[PDB]
């Protein structure tokens, strides 16, 4: 299994910054800092005097419309009682019906106005949009606020699960996609599993999963971003820290591993291995071994399956010398 | 053959930055990042309370206008039958016809207002303008979005 | 990586002005990308005729 180590940063699952939907001056703070907050619980209390006056005006308009509708309905009922034996014209009945319908429509409009006034008045009672844990209050009682300001009053974030955004260069992404398409790599199941290395180097007890491979490319660096999700039951990860992610990219069922004690590297960089031929002779063959897995070099070129090479006593064997070679586990 | 080799940068055929057309607060996210999406699919869900109230007010005004138009049309229809036998003066019939036409025009104006209200209400269901791949969400549930930020 | 991109594109000149701080003209070409083997923003080298 081939794994890539990438740098990244953590982030909250759901973060909401509290901004005032109205304008006014704060009077009280209804929450204690550093506590768990349920959704819909009021946080602050902005001055409601102007909105109270607007609500009262809306209520008065609604009452006036209701009185008009009431008198219209009474007239309609009386005229309908008259109409049974043709004691009033049908035109008068139709006019009364139209008046009642118009009054009812006006009542509906007044109710809508009262509803919007109530919504605005309740906006002053600042309510946390989501549950989570609330932090420091950037403002205190007595501080003026304005409708939809940029400065957030507080922040509510969810710490379980947590996101990890890591950075991968575009060239590596393209070469991995090409390898997957060609067939040298075998992905399995579904989303790739991602393991974590914290700032201290401790392996995270749980192994996360990656999804949402991004498509836009950063101009300044030339890399895309990858997202993984880690459940965080004990709150051992906090948003914003620097982490390293080990990301698996499939299976290569042709890997050649050679113990590092049986390869010789020249100072310039070339690597050679002492193979044993069928004639009981030793021959030096150059190989390409760039990546090291543990203590095993991963050979990419220069060796075939079944090739039989020396791993011990290299200083005791010279090329061109007939040597007994014995298998050792 | 003469050829020139130049540096260059790629760009998408069509890139759309999803922006809110109406102010409010976000209650839901109706898509998963890194997936191909179609056109007209609702992405987010902004709070519709105020826009719902405005829609209700517009519908009530439309109902009032329709009632007025209905009674005017009834009066015109009743006068038309009497006009045949020269039992109602042409001035009264002309006045009734004018009243009916004015009521119909008022109904048309109310319909235009309710259409504007419906468009504003439908703006809350943020719809993807085009079809293609969508990345991450720069905002999550509970965020506050202003008009045309 | 230096690998030639398998498909070919065409050239549609769009910009005629000269930039002040680069002193260069931007040429626009269009390419078919059915395999999604190139993303918006990467660096490429274009050979014209």
3-state SS, one letter per residue, for chain A: CCEEEEEEEEEECCEEEECCCCCEEEEEECCCCCEEECCCCECEEECCHHHHHHHHHHHHHHHHHHHHHHHHHHHHHHHHHHHCCCCCCHHHHHHHHHHHHHHHHHHHHHHHHHHHHHHHHHHCCCECCCCEEECCCCCCCCCEECCCCCCCCEEEECCCCEEEEEEEEHHHHHHHHHHHHHCCCECCCCCCEEEEECCCCCECCCCEEEECCCCCCCCCCCEEEEEEEECCCCCCCCCCCEEEEEEECCECCCCEEEEHHHEEECCCCCEEEEEECCCCEEEEEEEEEEEEECCEEEEEECCCCCCCECCCCHHHCCCCCECCCCCCC
d(CA A79, CA A96): 8
Record: contact A218-C41, CB cut-off 8 A? yes
d(CA B149, CA B23): 9
d(CA A283, CA A232): 55
Neighbours of A132 (CB within 10 A): 23
d(CA A27, CA A135): 19
Q: Residue C31, SS3?
A: coil
d(CA B109, CA B48): 24
Question: Which of A174, A215, A226 should we substitute to test contact with B (largest number of B Cβ atoms within 10 Å)?
Answer: A215
- Burial degree of A99 (CB within 10 A; 0-12, 13-18, 19+): buried
d(CA A290, CA A62): 82
Q: Helix crossing, A49-83 with A90-123: angle to 10°?
A: 160
First to last CA, chain B: 52
d(CA B22, CA B149): 10
Phi, psi values for residue A110, rounded to 5°: -65, -40
**Closest-CA distance of chain C to residue B34, Å:** 14
d(CA A141, CA A119): 23
Chains meeting B at 3+ CB pairs closer than 8 A?
Answer: A, C
**Closest-CA distance of chain C to residue B35, Å:** 14
Closest alpha carbon to A316 in A288, A258, A274:
A274
d(CA A192, CA A181): 16
Closest residue in chain A to residue C40, using alpha carbons only: A216
Tell me which method was used to determine the 3D structure.
Answer: cryo-EM
Structure tokens at A186: 């075998």
Structure tokens at A179: 């390898």
Phi, psi values for residue A153, rounded to 5°: -75, -40
Expressed in Å, this structure's resolution amounts to 3.3
| H helix count then E strand count, chain B | 2, 6
d(CA B33, CA A170): 19
d(CA C42, CA A218): 8
Question: Which residues in chain C are closer than 8 Å to A223, comparing Cβ atoms?
Answer: none
**Closest-CA distance of chain B to residue A106, Å:** 7
Closest residue in chain C to residue A214, using alpha carbons only: C39
CB A58, CB A117: distance < 8 Å: yes
Following CA atoms B84, B85, B87, B90 in sequence, which dihedral angle do they give, to the nearest 10 degrees? 40
Phi, psi values for residue C8, rounded to 5°: -120, 150
Record: contact C47-B5, CB cut-off 8 A? yes
Closest residue in chain B to residue C27, using alpha carbons only: B8
């Amino acid at each position: 299994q081939i794994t890539t180590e990438l740098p990244g940063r953590t982030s909250a699952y759901r973060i909401a910054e509290v901004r005032p939907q109205v304008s006014g001056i704060i009077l009280k703070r209804n929450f204690k800092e550093g506590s768990d907050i349920e959704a819909g619980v009021s946080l602050y209390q902005i001055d409601p005097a102007t909105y109270q006056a607007t609500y009262d005006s809306a209520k008065g308009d609604l009452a006036k419309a209701q009185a008009a509708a009431n008198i219209a309905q009474l007239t309609v009922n009386r005229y309908q009682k008259l109409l049974g034996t043709q004691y009033i014209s049908k035109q008068e009945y139709d006019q009364a019906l139209a008046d009642a319908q118009q009054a009812n429509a006006a009542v509906t409009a007044a109710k809508a106005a009262v509803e919007t006034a109530r919504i605005n008045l309740a906006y002053t009672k600042v309510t946390s949009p989501i549950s989570g844990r609330i932090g420091k209050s950037n403002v205190t009682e007595g501080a003026l606020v304005q409708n939809g300001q940029a400065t957030a009053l507080a922040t509510v974030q969810q710490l379980d699960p947590i996101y990890v955004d890591v950075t991968q260069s575009s060239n590596d992404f393209l070469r991995l996609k090409q390898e997957l398409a060609n067939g040298t790599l075998k992905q399995e199941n579904g989303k790739a599993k991602v393991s974590l290395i914290t700032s201290d180097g401790i392996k995270f007890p749980q192994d996360g999963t990656l999804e949402f491979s991004d498509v836009t490319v950063d101009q300044t660096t030339g890399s895309i971003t990858l997202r993984a999700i880690f459940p965080n039951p004990d709150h051992t990860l906090l948003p914003g820290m620097f982490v390293r992610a080990r990301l698996e990219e499939g299976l290569n069922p042709n890997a050649i591993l050679v113990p590092q004690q049986g390869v010789t590297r020249t100072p310039r960089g070339d690597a050679t291995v002492l193979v044993v031929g069928a004639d009981d002779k030793v021959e030096t063959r150059p190989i390409v071994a760039s990546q090291a897995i543990g203590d095993k070099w991963l050979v990419t070129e220069g060796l075939k399956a079944g090739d039989r090479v020396v791993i011990s006593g290299l200083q005791k064997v010279r090329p061109g010398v007939q040597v007994k070679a014995q298998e050792v586990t």
